[PDB]
Amino acid sequence: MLYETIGIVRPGNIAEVKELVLTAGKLILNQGGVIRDIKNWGTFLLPRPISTNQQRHNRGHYFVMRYDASIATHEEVRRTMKADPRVIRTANVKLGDGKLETLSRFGAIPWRSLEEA
Amino acid sequence: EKEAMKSEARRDAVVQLYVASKNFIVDEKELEEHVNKHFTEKIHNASGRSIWDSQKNPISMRELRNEFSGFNTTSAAVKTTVRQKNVAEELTGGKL
Amino acid sequence: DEPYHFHIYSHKHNTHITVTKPNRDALISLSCGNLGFKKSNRKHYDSAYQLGAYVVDKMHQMNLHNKIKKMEVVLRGFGPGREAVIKVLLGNEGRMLRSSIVRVSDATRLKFGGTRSKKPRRLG
Amino acid sequence: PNKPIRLPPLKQLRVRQANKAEENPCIAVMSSVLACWASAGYNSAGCATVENALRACMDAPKPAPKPNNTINYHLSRFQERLTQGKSK
Amino acid sequence: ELENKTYESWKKWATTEIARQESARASMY
Amino acid sequence: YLLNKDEFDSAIQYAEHILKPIKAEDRLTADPEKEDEEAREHAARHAKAVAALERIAKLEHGGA
Amino acid sequence: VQELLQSEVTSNNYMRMMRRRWNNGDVYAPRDLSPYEMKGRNGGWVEAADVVDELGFSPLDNYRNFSLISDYITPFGRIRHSKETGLKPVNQRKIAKMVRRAIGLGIHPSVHKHPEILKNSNGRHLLPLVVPKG
Amino acid sequence: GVSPGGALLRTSRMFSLPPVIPPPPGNKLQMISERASATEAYPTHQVLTTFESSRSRGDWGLKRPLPLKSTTGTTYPMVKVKEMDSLEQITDFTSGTQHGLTLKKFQALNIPISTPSEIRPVQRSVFEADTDVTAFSPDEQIQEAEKRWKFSGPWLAGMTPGEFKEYLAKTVRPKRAEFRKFIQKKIAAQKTEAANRELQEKPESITDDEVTEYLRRLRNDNQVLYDLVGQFLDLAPLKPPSPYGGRGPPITHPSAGISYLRTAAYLNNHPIYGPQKSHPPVQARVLKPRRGNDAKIGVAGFVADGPLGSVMDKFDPSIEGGAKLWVNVDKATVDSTGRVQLTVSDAKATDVLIAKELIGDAREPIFGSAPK
Amino acid sequence: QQELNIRLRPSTGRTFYVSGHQDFAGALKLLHRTVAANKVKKDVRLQRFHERPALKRKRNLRERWRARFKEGFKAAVNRTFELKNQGW
RNA sequence: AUUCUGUGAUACCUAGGGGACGGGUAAAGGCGAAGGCAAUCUUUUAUGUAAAAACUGACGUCGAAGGACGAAGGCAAAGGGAACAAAAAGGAUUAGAUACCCCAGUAGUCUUUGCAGACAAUUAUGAAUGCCAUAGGUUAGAUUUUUAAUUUAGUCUAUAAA
Ligand SMILES: [K+]
Ligand SMILES: [K+]
Ligand SMILES: [K+]
Ligand SMILES: [K+]
Ligand SMILES: [K+]
Ligand SMILES: [Mg+2]
Ligand SMILES: [Mg+2]
Ligand SMILES: [Mg+2]
Ligand SMILES: [Mg+2]
Ligand SMILES: [Mg+2]
Ligand SMILES: [Mg+2]
Ligand SMILES: [Mg+2]
Ligand SMILES: [Mg+2]
Ligand SMILES: [Mg+2]
Ligand SMILES: [Mg+2]
Ligand SMILES: [Mg+2]
Ligand SMILES: [Mg+2]
Ligand SMILES: [Mg+2]
Ligand SMILES: [Mg+2]
Ligand SMILES: [Mg+2]
Ligand SMILES: [Mg+2]
Ligand SMILES: [Mg+2]
């Protein structure tokens, strides 16, 4: 099913992103998923200063990954992400409606346009 | 015939999902290549370290309504092309 | 550089006026009772007016009308002091500090559900 | 957004205050006098122009009443036509 | 011609309301 | 998505037959450097789409 | 220079009373200049017709757009009423639920507009800062 | 089989009242006012008149006689009826002089309407046997379709994103079968061309194989395809490879039934002076001065942009009645939206002086007194 | 910002800055209007005590009808003066 | 008044921790057999509604009893415990004050497993079928010359015959 995860990793190191994105990416592909697009947003302010693992953060490194996998895989990608101490927070959503008509119009994550559905 | 129409509409979606499969990532090779291409230190015009600099603001209502009220101005030539195709692709059903 | 803050907390029974420095550290933290107003005489509009005038007068004694270039006025609560202190900060009392204000905000505390409140009162 | 409803059948369609209620003018002028006394002081000099303005109102004659606004008559005409009807 | 008579009436109303706001602005201070 | 092997396969075959790089109008005008290039590229791209769609239409990756 | 400057202010004053934006082709009668018409008695600057249906976008699928979520909440962070948005009960419920999803997921403030949007608006250099205090 | 009483109502004058046409189209995403509404671009309801004797009684051929307070006294009796009988048992009407006299004003300018020209001025009439044509045949080639002005299909660039999707899924999607037949007719004629030619020195049009392959030959040349698709849906040509493509086809007749003059190539012979050079000037108002990067002026009820050129710079309260300047209307045309855009051009000095002379308000008479 | 992060708190949204065409006296007006459109004072009053779900629901039904009636009444008072203008 | 505070309170901040709550949206709105259900993501579940075709071919309605479900409060066990708050207790008011009001405050409210089965569990109106003339709103769809009208299933006002 078409899912979409928005992970917010700590801003300190770029390398942390690649490892995490690859870890979740390789996982989805191994299970049998199909990653559609992995956009790379930079480091901007968070909704509010939050504290995770005895550390105060004001801006994290955002990244959006839109993939199509099973329920068992999606749950695993969510737990592995949350277990990572390097992620400030994640936001997974069952993108789409469930019908094939709208499921075939989801391409790259848009920023200057809308997801015409 | 009524059941056939559903098959065609069901097929057109597959043809559309087929054309959009060029940017998908199926193997770990394409993943690593893609990640290294987009995840770099000086990617967002660096200066600046955010997508809020090269693509400053995400499209908003004011910008949307302005595309059809304020302007109408040469975006029609760009928009019309995308639209004309969609009309042709539907009739022919060949996703030109 | 954050401006100085001029919090004005006012509720049904009293009014507090705090003047903190940019790092939010109280410099003049007074109330209506500091002027001698006792149990119920610290809720009247006139008492809140005098308090604001006294705090402003104490600011001049500390030479804060030539030391603060940017100031902020925060309004918490909808008590009688909300309008009283303003007229003190808008009339003749406040005229050296009046032309140094950059922001005016409201800090009234609201809860989105929060904890259960007290049961309604049967005054009759 | 929905449109205004059709009023139910009322006994009489009218407005309570047909004509605006006029507020005594210098009651505000008195407020200014009181305000100056609070800030400046009772026996001051800047209160002269303000105190003299309060004495000016009482001496001045009150205006005459305005002509009645015939609005309740027309509302009674179109009551049965605008609303569901009349009740009694 | 009719516009002249109507435009002049608008000038009067504008002048009055303009002066009204000016007098209403003296109370803000 | 109310699909079966038949409809899926027919769609794939159909989809590929409509995007096949159209060969040049005549032989002499044709350039084997470009034609052969598009053929290999198109074939590889088609193989990818098949592997991708097959995974999306899988009934094991669905819900209740 | 004193007369010109003063005259300009008085000129703009009247220009503020003409609550109408004349366009090309708009027919105007001798009554369109009367004060009764220029007053702009209409108290509602409402939306024309269901902007959501025109743009044909599923709101629930655009929960990422921060500017889109900051357009349907008041500066205090409260979802706007159907009167302001001018949407249908269905489209309103979709946008209302799209604003609650983002706030619930923890990717958008619930008491003000997104911080990155506060930097581009008026008062960018006056935004309340946080002194380290230590 | 119609009854005699039913046959009289069919031809009655009241039954002839046209339906209320949709209002002038505006931007679908704006903040139009609801409680108060200004005059519209073009009229929507039919204007009515009556005899001077029947007007004094309030009889307008309607359900009931109208009131005499607001219906008598004016020179031109004009009235519009929104509802012959509303829920208040009253004929909801309103004055119709706003649009009724505006048509008379515009018809006093003696200016035709011509097709807009991209920016050698060529004012071509709208009423011609080559351009003003709606009927057609399927056999007609694409070129003549540009001449037409009334297309059945919508304008893609104008349609909103939501309207476009609805059009596709309700007008284009359920037409593939018919479109396939359309191609067969074309392919059929193609086979006859070669045969006819060689014979000098049609088939049944049933070939489901060539059609599928015929469309694969046009995927490299999208231009010729759209050219063919435009004929099956009656879409207005958009790409240059032109006329009224910037703002799309006119929703109405290019003249919009406001003026039926074909040309202005005439010289009004003045009684004394003689054949004048240009047309008589017209006095206009000033709205929204420059100091909005343009000035608006009211030329005979309509609002147009000021001439390409004091008066326009700044507003002047001292001037009684407002700034009024003389000006000559050069060209008039109707845009896609239906508005009447006028190419107002600054007037000359002598023209105004000559025109004022008849009015009797000319300060100095050119006739006689003028020594030089 | 780069060296100092913005203080993100409920008061940040309820903030109004002083500009050339908007002095301190004017900012208060904008504040009071925005604080009244969001019903901050009302919320403080409704949050002083607890209102169980039933009472809250029943209180809304009464307040919502008085708003519809008032809105439906204002439309009738203006429909009257519309018909009166036409001379009916 | 009891009460909190010089063992530094209220007020203004910084950094951590902990529990239950659900602001706006919000409406005569909606969903379930009812009781009842309003922050959010994923997962999971039975009906119901609209339009077209196709299919089974009376397979339907009500339903003592049994069984299931059933608000708040209550009982039992183990958690939780910020807030609210029966009880117990104090301070006032009063002729007297158990009270209403106030400073505080335990069960309980919450989580898990059972018991319990009483409610103005109400539309003071059992469920279901056939049928009877209109108007103005409103909810979720459908059709159309989609502008605005027809139309299906609900809901709410005001009427005709009765
Ligand atoms: K104190
Ligand atoms: K302390
Ligand atoms: K039973
Ligand atoms: K007691
Ligand atoms: K109904
Ligand atoms: Mg208590
Ligand atoms: Mg009592
Ligand atoms: Mg918590
Ligand atoms: Mg109930
Ligand atoms: Mg709520
Ligand atoms: Mg139901
Ligand atoms: Mg049978
Ligand atoms: Mg049963
Ligand atoms: Mg229970
Ligand atoms: Mg219990
Ligand atoms: Mg126990
Ligand atoms: Mg308590
Ligand atoms: Mg039980
Ligand atoms: Mg109950
Ligand atoms: Mg029963
Ligand atoms: Mg209901
Ligand atoms: Mg009834």
In short:
Chain E: It is found in: Mitochondrion. Chain D is 41% helix and 0% strand.
Write the layout of secondary structure elements.
The structure is cut from a larger assembly and holds 9 protein chains of 9 kinds.
Chain E: H1 2-25
Chain H: H1 4-10, H2 52-55, E1 79-83, E2 92-95, H3 97-106, H4 142-147, H5 161-172, H6 176-200, H7 208-216, H8 222-233, E3 282-285, E4 296-299, E5 302-305, E6 324-334, E7 340-346, H9 349-359
Antiparallel strand pairs in H: 1-2, 3-6, 4-5, 6-7
Helix pairs in contact in H: 6-7
Chain I: H1 10-13, E1 15-17, H2 24-37, H3 40-46, H4 53-86
The complex binds potassium ion (5 copies) and magnesium ion (17 copies).
Chain C binds one RNA strand of 162 nucleotides through residues 5, 7, 9, 14, 16-20, 23-27, 29-31, 110-119, 121-124.
How would you describe this structure to a colleague?
This is part of a larger assembly, with nine protein chains of nine kinds. Chain B has helices at residues 2-19, 28-38, 51-54, 61-68, 75-92. Chain B is mainly α. In chain D, α1 (26-39) runs antiparallel to α2 (48-59). Chain D contains four helices and no strands. The longest helix of chain D is centred in the middle third of the chain and has 14 residues, at 26-39. Chain E contains one helix and no strands. Chain E starts with a helix and ends with a helix. At the D-H interface, loops of D face loops of H. β6 of chain C pairs antiparallel with β1 of chain I. One potassium ion is lined by residues 30-31, 34 of chain C. Chain C binds one RNA strand of 162 nucleotides through β3 and β4. Chain G: Its main location: mitochondrion.
Any idea what the radius of gyration of chain H is?
Answer: 28 Å
Name the pair of protein chains with the most residues at their interface, and give those residue counts.
G-H, 36 and 46 residues
Order of helices and strands of chain H: HHEEHHHHHHEEEEEH
What's the count of strands of chain H? 7
CA(first)-CA(last) distance of chain H: 81 Å
Q: Strand share of the residues of chain H?
A: 5-15%
Using the alpha-carbon principal axes, give the shape of chain H: globular
Radius of gyration of chain G: 22 Å
- Name the hetero compounds present: potassium ion, magnesium ion
Straight-line distance between termini of chain G: 55 Å
Q: Level of helix content of chain G?
A: 40-55%
| Helix share, percent of chain H | 25-40%
Annotation, overall tally of beta strands of chain G: 0
| Count of separate DSSP helical elements of chain G | 7
Profile the largest sheet of chain G.
none
Overall body shape of chain G? flat
**How would you sum up the major sheet of chain H?**
3 strands, antiparallel
Key terms for this structure?
part of a larger assembly, 9 chains, A: 117 residues, alpha+beta, 5-stranded antiparallel beta sheet, 3 helices, globular, G: 134 residues, mainly alpha, 42% helix, binds potassium ion, RNA-binding
